[PDB]
């Protein structure tokens, strides 16, 4: 079958915000700014939240002082409350509204 490449989307770049998938409902920015600073030290928190429920969308946004940590929290996963979360670079698919917003 057709399977097979070589050298994934590799491009130069600088520190960036992080998305996080697999997030617990209980767990909020204050608190992600706590865990996250295990790590060494929270530049950016923020947990998206859905205006249907109420309830957290389960992900959210975070960014570290140091590339190299950002970068390595990025490589490894890990277990907040005892759920599974991961950190994932924003790619086109999911482009966050700001300041200019039609409607």
Known sequence: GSS???????????????????????TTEQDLKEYFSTFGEVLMVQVKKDLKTGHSKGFGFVR??????????????????????????PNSKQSQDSGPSSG
């Open 4 to 26: 097979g490449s070589s050298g994934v989307k590799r491009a130069v770049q600088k520190t960036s915000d992080l998305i996080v998938l697999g997030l617990p409902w209980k």
């Open 64 to 89: 570290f002082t140091e590339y190299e940590t950002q970068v390595k929290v990025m490589s490894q996963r890990h277990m907040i409350d005892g759920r599974w979360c991961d950190c994932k670079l």
